């Protein structure tokens, strides 16, 4: 399906041509957009692999102290908003590439690596918030600021090219950059609550009160906002009710 060009190979040979402005090519902001997403993939995959894939099938992760860093419901709600608008950008890339010819790859691959980076960001956040350790997620802080700096430079290059609010991808980049600014609640997570790294005290929030093995095992009102909604504690009990009876 073509020679799989990034900028199209449109037989002007000119979408590759940066001549008059070094960020004014328009594909260089799209090629600069994939830098935090492959940064978060190639940083987050060995940390998640050494921390959680590399424990054995014999040994066993803990089943209480599901302590949330604050801003947790807001971060999961904005991550599902992020996944919604990245599915909208992938559908815009499908609708924008196939009208001419031969597979302009820059309309797919930023939102494809952004979609994979956002889902590894949220499973990285659930793995850090389960295992409580706040000395990581500064990788998430430099991810959200690198995505914010590349989306602001894409938005001011859209503003320089007089692209108003009739095109979709101008408005979709605007929802992405107002979203990525509001995905900097990591600064809410470090200052005024949970001073983990660059402040002189730790804040030291206590664990929740039913989780000192109080025999509760109800597991709903302190679990994450996906699994509050889809009840992913409950399928462990539905598996345990197979090949056992359930007593009091």
């Amino acid at each position: 399906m073509g020679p799989l060009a990034f900028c199209g190979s449109e037989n002007h040979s000119a979408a590759y041509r940066v001549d008059q402005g070094v960020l004014n090519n328009g594909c260089f902001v799209d090629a600069l957009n994939v830098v935090p997403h492959v940064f978060l993939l190639f940083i987050t995959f060995p940390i998640l692999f050494i921390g959680w894939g590399s424990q054995s099938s014999k040994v066993h992760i803990h089943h209480s102290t599901w302590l949330h860093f604050p801003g947790h419901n807001l971060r999961w709600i904005l991550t599902f908003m992020l996944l919604f608008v990245l599915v909208c950008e992938i559908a815009e890339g499908i609708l924008s590439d196939g009208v001419t010819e031969s597979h302009h790859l820059h309309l797919y691959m930023p939102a494809g690596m952004a979609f994979m980076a956002a889902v590894t960001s949220v499973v990285y956040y659930h793995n850090i918030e389960t295992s409580n350790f706040p000395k990581l997620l500064i990788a998430l802080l430099v991810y959200w600021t690198l995505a914010f700096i590349t989306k602001t430079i894409k938005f001011v290059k859209f503003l320089d090219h007089a692209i108003g609010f009739s095109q979709l991808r101008f408005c979709l980049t605007g929802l992405l950059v107002i979203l990525y600014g509001m995905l900097l609640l990591v600064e809410v997570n470090v200052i005024r609550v949970r001073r983990y790294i660059f402040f002189k005290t730790p804040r030291e929030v206590k664990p929740p009160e039913d989780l000192q093995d109080l025999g509760v095992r109800f597991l709903q009102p302190f679990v994450n906002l996906l699994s509050k909604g889809t009840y992913w504690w409950m399928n462990a009990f539905i598996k345990t009710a197979h090949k056992k009876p359930i007593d009091l």
């Binding site: 109800f218 009710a241 009876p245 359930i246 007593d247 009091l248």
Partner: protein, 49 residues
Amino acid sequence: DLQQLDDTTQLPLLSHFAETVEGLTTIRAFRYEARFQQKLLEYTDSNNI
């Protein structure tokens, strides 16, 4: 399993009400009112979970 568990904890709560309201004068004979109140709190927590 869970619906049968809810019915077999729903029955001793009404048994505790039916033996409170029967033996009311002989449970206010003793000072064993708070023990029966803690028994109703254990019955209604098991029925609630």
